[PDB]
Design an enzyme around this catalytic site. Sequence first.
Site, PDB file in Angstrom:
ATOM      1  N   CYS A  61       0.510  -6.011   7.697  1.00 57.72           N
ATOM      2  CA  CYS A  61       0.666  -6.310   6.289  1.00 57.72           C
ATOM      3  C   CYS A  61       1.397  -7.636   6.083  1.00 57.72           C
ATOM      4  CB  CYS A  61       1.382  -5.158   5.547  1.00 57.72           C
ATOM      5  SG  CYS A  61       2.914  -4.552   6.324  1.00 57.72           S
ATOM      6  N   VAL A 114       0.194 -10.477   3.369  1.00 54.53           N
ATOM      7  CA  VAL A 114       0.959 -11.043   2.258  1.00 54.53           C
ATOM      8  C   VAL A 114       0.900 -12.583   2.253  1.00 54.53           C
ATOM      9  CG1 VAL A 114       3.245 -11.278   1.242  1.00 54.53           C
ATOM     10  CG2 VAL A 114       2.482  -9.070   2.041  1.00 54.53           C
TER      11      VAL A 114
HETATM   12  S1  CLF Z   1       6.449  -4.391  12.069  1.00 51.63           S
HETATM   13 FE1  CLF Z   1       3.609  -0.627   8.585  1.00 51.63          FE
HETATM   14  S2  CLF Z   1       2.371   0.007  10.354  1.00 51.63           S
HETATM   15 FE2  CLF Z   1       2.343  -2.223  10.096  1.00 51.63          FE
HETATM   16  S3  CLF Z   1       0.402  -2.801   8.885  1.00 51.63           S
HETATM   17 FE3  CLF Z   1       2.335  -2.587   7.563  1.00 51.63          FE
HETATM   18  S4  CLF Z   1       2.214  -0.451   6.729  1.00 51.63           S
HETATM   19 FE4  CLF Z   1       0.831  -0.517   8.643  1.00 51.63          FE
HETATM   20 FE5  CLF Z   1       7.576  -2.412  11.687  1.00 51.63          FE
HETATM   21  S5  CLF Z   1       8.163  -2.589   9.447  1.00 51.63           S
HETATM   22 FE6  CLF Z   1       6.208  -1.478   9.594  1.00 51.63          FE
HETATM   23  S6  CLF Z   1       5.909  -0.782  11.733  1.00 51.63           S
HETATM   24 FE7  CLF Z   1       4.941  -2.793  11.391  1.00 51.63          FE
HETATM   25  S7  CLF Z   1       4.372  -2.871   8.964  1.00 51.63           S
HETATM   26 FE8  CLF Z   1       6.393  -4.002   9.796  1.00 51.63          FE
END
Ligand code: CLF
Lengths: 271, 477, 522, 522
Positions: free
Chosen positions: D152, D156
């Site tokens: 994501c 963005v």
């Molecule tokens: S580093 Fe989350 S799993 Fe991702 S594509 Fe976004 S919803 Fe799907 Fe860490 S905080 Fe989270 S797990 Fe990744 S997005 Fe970032």
Amino acid sequence: AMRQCAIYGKGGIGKSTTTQNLVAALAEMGKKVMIVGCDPKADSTRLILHSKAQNTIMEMAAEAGTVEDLELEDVLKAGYGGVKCVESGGPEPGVGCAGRGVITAINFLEEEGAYEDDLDFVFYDVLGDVVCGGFAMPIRENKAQEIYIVCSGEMMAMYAANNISKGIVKYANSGSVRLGGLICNSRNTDREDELIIALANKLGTQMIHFVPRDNVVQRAEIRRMTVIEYDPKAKQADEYRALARKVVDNKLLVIPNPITMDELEELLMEF
Amino acid sequence: MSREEVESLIQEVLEVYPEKARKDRNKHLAVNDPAVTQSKKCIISNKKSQPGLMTIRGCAYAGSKGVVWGPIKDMIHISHGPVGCGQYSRAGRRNYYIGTTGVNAFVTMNFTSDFQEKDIVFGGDKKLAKLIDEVETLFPLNKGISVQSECPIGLIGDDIESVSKVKGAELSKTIVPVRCEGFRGVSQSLGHHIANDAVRDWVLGKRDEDTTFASTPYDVAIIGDYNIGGDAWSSRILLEEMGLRCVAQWSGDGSISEIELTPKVKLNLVHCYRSMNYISRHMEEKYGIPWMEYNFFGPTKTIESLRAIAAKFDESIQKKCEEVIAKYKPEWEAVVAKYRPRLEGKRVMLYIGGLRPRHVIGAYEDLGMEVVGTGYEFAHNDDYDRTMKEMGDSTLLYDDVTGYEFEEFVKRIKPDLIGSGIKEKFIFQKMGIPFRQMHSWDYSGPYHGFDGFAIFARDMDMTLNNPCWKKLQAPWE
Amino acid sequence: SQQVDKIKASYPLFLDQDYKDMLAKKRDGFEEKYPQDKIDEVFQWTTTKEYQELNFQREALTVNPAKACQPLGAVLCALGFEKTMPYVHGSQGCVAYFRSYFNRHFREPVSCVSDSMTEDAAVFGGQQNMKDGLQNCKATYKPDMIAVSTTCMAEVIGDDLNAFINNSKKEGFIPDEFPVPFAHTPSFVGSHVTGWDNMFEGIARYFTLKSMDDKVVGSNKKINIVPGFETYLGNFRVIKRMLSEMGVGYSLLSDPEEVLDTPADGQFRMYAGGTTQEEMKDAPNALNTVLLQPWHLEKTKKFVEGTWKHEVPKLNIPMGLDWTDEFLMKVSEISGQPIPASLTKERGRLVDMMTDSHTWLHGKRFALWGDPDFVMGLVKFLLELGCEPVHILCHNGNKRWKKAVDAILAASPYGKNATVYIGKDLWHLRSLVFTDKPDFMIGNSYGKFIQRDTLHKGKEFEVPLIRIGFPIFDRHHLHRSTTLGYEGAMQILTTLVNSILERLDEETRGMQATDYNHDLVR
Amino acid sequence: SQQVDKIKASYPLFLDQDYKDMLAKKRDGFEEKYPQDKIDEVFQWTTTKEYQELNFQREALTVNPAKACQPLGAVLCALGFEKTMPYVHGSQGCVAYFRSYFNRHFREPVSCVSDSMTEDAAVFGGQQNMKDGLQNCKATYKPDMIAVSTTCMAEVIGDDLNAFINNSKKEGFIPDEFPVPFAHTPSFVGSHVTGWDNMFEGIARYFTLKSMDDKVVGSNKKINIVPGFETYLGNFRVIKRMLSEMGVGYSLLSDPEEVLDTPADGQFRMYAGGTTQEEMKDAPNALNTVLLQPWHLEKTKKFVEGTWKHEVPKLNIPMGLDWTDEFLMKVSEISGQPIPASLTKERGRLVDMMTDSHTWLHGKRFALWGDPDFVMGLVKFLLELGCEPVHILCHNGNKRWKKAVDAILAASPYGKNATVYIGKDLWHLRSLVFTDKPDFMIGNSYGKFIQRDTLHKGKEFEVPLIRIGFPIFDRHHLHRSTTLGYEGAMQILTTLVNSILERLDEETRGMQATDYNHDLVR
Ligand code: CLF
Ligand SMILES: Nc1ncnc2c1ncn2[C@@H]1O[C@H](COP(=O)(O)OP(=O)(O)CP(=O)(O)O)[C@@H](O)[C@H]1O
Ligand code: ICS
Ligand code: CLF
Ligand code: SF4
Ligand SMILES: [Fe+3]
Ligand SMILES: [Fe+3]
Ligand SMILES: [Mg+2]
């Protein structure tokens, strides 16, 4: 070319004695023979073995729990002349099912390869009261192919012959068992030989041998022996050798034509 | 439908048989006349089955152990003989009971003498004596023992009466020898009779000279309800709401003490006539106790039965009767309002044992359904006498029907629903015909009484109108 | 009472207060029941080692056997042949039970006839029943073959099947060339599996005994497969699938897989598929014959070795990893076909599953029962999985089989707490799971009453049943499963580990008590 | 303490008295815990209609969702192509989670890389990460193809995948002809199934968009099959088995069944099987393209209809009897091959099972959840069985899908009590199974906490979970199962009816209380 033979006849007519004396004579000739007792009183091999205890198939099975646990050398013994002896066994009188005992015992012998080894003859010695299917186990297909019926000149003994022949027919029509002849175990009646020859022809068979009444047979039995073993040179011993020779060379195997109880009464008046 | 046409179908189906079987089977198939009062003029029954034709019938052992004795819950029942019979019959019949199984109740268990070849040849009376000692050791709260003979016991002449008497005295226990060897008779039916006689001879007279039971004038017994899926309980609740006292039920959820107390009742209520009319007649002859047949299948029969029963007593009971009938009226009316529109006009064929083929007809009719063929495995002509007036004119009757016949009849009559046994069920489902088990209730029930009617109606609708029945033909065919 | 929109069947109807009240009155009034404290005391006693000693001293009484009788097996064998009607000479009660028993396990029609010998046929013999029965059955159900076995009454009185059948032919009740093979199947000998062996050997004899002279071992380039008594459809199917996958020509002798699984498409099919008569007649020309369940195919083996002269391989039932490996290598050896990449991959996928689940399986303790070959295959695979068989029961086992299973147990450190019982029943097994509690039982539906008994002692004493075997009456469609081969091992492994995990979830479902271990991921 | 011969893990170790006492002292000393009475009162309130009202008024909070995010689905799709490395442009935490999530469901390795964008890559964009990432991945893991999706953060900031990949090639980091299909997969749009759609369309576009001029519809005589997001290996297998049985030429586009089921034979295989690049290139020459899960394959459909010019059939997922029928008939029409006897028989065997089991299934009430196509297929089959779906939840469903499922429900009298919920989660579903209790739940492992909650209210309120869906983490090897076709319908039927019978046995296992209905035979 092992020949399987079954002995039937009126209760008390001399089946077991005649069979064992016959078999002794066969063994004396160099024939290898097995006797299968098909009577719960287990007295078919008493005169051939007479040394050491005999254990029956059914008795040994009960002790071991089932027939599957039984071994052939536990119940199969050799006596006079190397004749191999085995008894079905069965209950004491008035309990259980002796018929099934004979079925079970002969099935065991078949399954354990008793009929392997190179025997010339097997004889089934059956009781007089053939009251069920089990006591006809010896004349099923793959068992006895030749029946000898022991009789005498007495009415009850001829009626027995005829009635036994009746029972034989359903097996003879459906398989290869055949009547081989009548054995006249004499009761010293008038013109006995002619009369049994006569009954033979109505049935369609033969009187293969006339066995005289001779109390040496009973003296041998009391000593638990055949005449062949007890007194090898007795007249009666020669009779059994004669009988044995006929049996060896016999080719006459027929299906019985039983007659009416009326024809039988005709026979006995006309003599 | 149409008498000549049904008679035509019968003769067509019979064409396949050899002459001997054809001649015989002809006598066991009939087109009903409700007028006829003597069924002997129209159909023959309770005769030996023709060899090789796939009868649905069982044996005298099934009739004795499986049906009459097996449900008695505080006795231990010995399947005496080889291992087969007791194993196939273990918990196959849903004769419901309340107990601690293996401790004070034993219905679902299989006790057997497991005959081996040495037992046949040497007889099994010594084994049976030892078996009885072991039962007493390992199940000390059992309240009696029955010895249910299988085929070989009957042939070889084991003396099980002597064993029962000697061990019975030695252990102060009721031991009941039953000669129900399976080759006796022609069906389950002679097993009923043999079992009734064993109850008569060995159990029923035990309290003949005992007066410690306090009887009332409203004492009854339910005779011949085996409590299939709880059938007897949903009958017993109605009788007791009506103010009667049910001292015994024979033999569903039954106990040996109930059987012994039964000679103290005022009236015997007989549901299964076939299996228990014998002991019912006995009890009237010896004890003076009258008996009456009743029918608790559906509201019309239940209501009629409740009033008939109540008329046997006094005004207090008759008042309570009408109060019970009033209580349940909106309940079965709601069942009819809901389900009768879903079932109206549907046509049913039945084949069951010795009672249900006539007894359930009223219930089907309460749902607007029509029974167009019925028949029995082992009914006698006094059963067919009661059947012909319950069935419509020109309906089909069949006695001891063959697998072949039943299928051919079904192909031509084309019922919407068939009610028969487990050996029939899967045959007809494959033909796309909704099928209800009318022995086991298809693991549902009860069907007796008012509460039972609601379940019966639910079950018939669930099956007859199930979406599976529209799916049997592949669209591309 | 009933609410029309929520109708109650027996459960929970009879839990209603008015029914409970009525039942209490029935009990107290008329049943003269032992007091509850006495019942509890006796129940507790039946869970003890003292009771167990009394229980194992039984010599005459059998309680809850785990076997059936010969003709049940003969019938199942006969059903595996094309357009063949099983026919049981003797009393008709037997056949109603055989058909019902099988109806309930397969949820299918089971077609079988009797010749309905009655009391007078017991006394006079059943010759006339055989004559009319064969003619009737042939006319009515039109089989291509009738396979005759016996009930115990016909075995006691010594009805000669051979004679009776030949007289039916000689007297014109059935055509002379119409095949009517037979076997004597006495219920007081052995068990249902013995009946299967006897029937099969009878059918094999009927088609080959008289025509051995033109036979040549190996000339049709196939391997015969004899399945034995088999009640999982998947087991017939997986053997055919693996042999075809290898490109091995084969002939499955007795194959009821189609007739036990006909489609519901608007017609009843009394017969379907099966071994053909030509397949049986040609069987001696096979390269060899493999017996899938050797511990109840001993009569068959004697006939096949002695008469067809096939060098029948000494192979265990193909269950679990090792014994499926050995089966495939022997088939490869006999036929000359290599084991294909697809089966090698299947093997590796079973091994993968074993590695994936080994931590939940390790050390788990089982009681189990069933038929001799089935039980020993299950014991072998449990050892491969690192499980502990503890109570091994085979009511119809024999001494030689028991010694063979003891040897398998001794060969693994996981077999050190195991005992093998023969001639013992499910009431014996009941005592065992109380006095020496395992984690699970693996057995047939009769085991549900043992689970019920163990729960009554207490939830911590409950021993859950895992249903594998025959008969299974109280679940639906499990007869479609597989226990043989890598596929059957995968199904069994999956059933075991998920039985374990299902129980652990049940034990950890207690809010704020045990649910600290109610893990999402296992 | 531990006894060495019977070591206790966390359960039941912490039930020992000394641990219980310790936990009591911790609670009372330092946790300032609400009184147990208050906890009980609030728990009871969470099971009520008044709580349900407050619950369904949520507009901002989501609790226990029943969906995951796009790149999960993109990774699964990528895994279905031969020697293809899924590559997720963005943050590495995502990939650790994607891999772990699938590891736990399949119990298999799951290979996927990140290009590990950090905070400075967020600010400056991830172009350097793409250049080095592609070169590193290709040199180290030697894929034949790298399939790129996004996390994501990269969505963005608008990282242009197309430009970043093409600059990687122009600058020599990877060869120009090396295939690098891509798709933008934003986690804040749709769900994991949308990511699958997007990834597939990206791969289909990559291999066909520029080469349409020589393509001729139908010239390779095959049918394309697009499975969508699929986590049962049996479902890939049953579709291939059925088409092969019919003699239909096919091409399964995205086929991960080999790489998600490699053998344990002593070597780790990072890649296995999969759709070939040649199959994707040749795909426009197919007769037509069938989408197995049309409600999440809408973008794919638009491309296939618009660019390949295939007349994609309007078919439902082939689940249950009717829709498997419809699938087979459409395939028959497209290919010109008839439906063979074997499949017709298989259909009838399913119908037979429905007739055998219909009395225990009838009227049984279910709550269920899962992805759109799966859920509607399950609803359809429940209706065919005479079951009543009551609470139907699809967190990632849309308004068009809901109306279609509502139409299916309205068409059956068994749908009259059903409500379809979209945008709602498992905390919503929890209220529903308290206020309008069904007999069972059908769903994934997250359903276990609901079963636990319902049991806490009381055994009579417990709603057992039947595990069908994704993910399943707390049972082993259920990912080997099948839910499509007649085979899948048989497996589901068997599961449903035996769940019903298993629960009935549990409810009737009470000695002298409920075991009057503990029937041997059902
Ligand atoms: S580093 Fe989350 S799993 Fe991702 S594509 Fe976004 S919803 Fe799907 Fe860490 S905080 Fe989270 S797990 Fe990744 S997005 Fe970032
Ligand atoms: N030829 C003969 N002369 C004198 N006595 C003879 C004889 N043949 C047999 N016996 C005697 O007749 C008696 C009965 O003989 P055996 O026991 O052989 O008859 P059997 O076998 O027919 C009796 P069962 O019918 O019970 O089987 C014996 O005491 C025997 O010694
Ligand atoms: S006893 Fe009889 S066959 Fe009257 S043997 Fe049979 S539990 Fe049937 S029609 Mo099974 S005379 Fe009972 C019967 Fe009816 S076992 Fe049940 S259903 S009402
Ligand atoms: S009519 Fe029993 S099932 Fe049979 S072959 Fe014997 S063990 Fe086996 Fe009735 S009493 Fe029983 S069930 Fe039959 S045998 Fe007779
Ligand atoms: S007559 Fe023969 S079969 Fe009948 S019991 Fe007596 S011995 Fe056994
Ligand atoms: Fe079926
Ligand atoms: Fe794995
Ligand atoms: Mg004698």
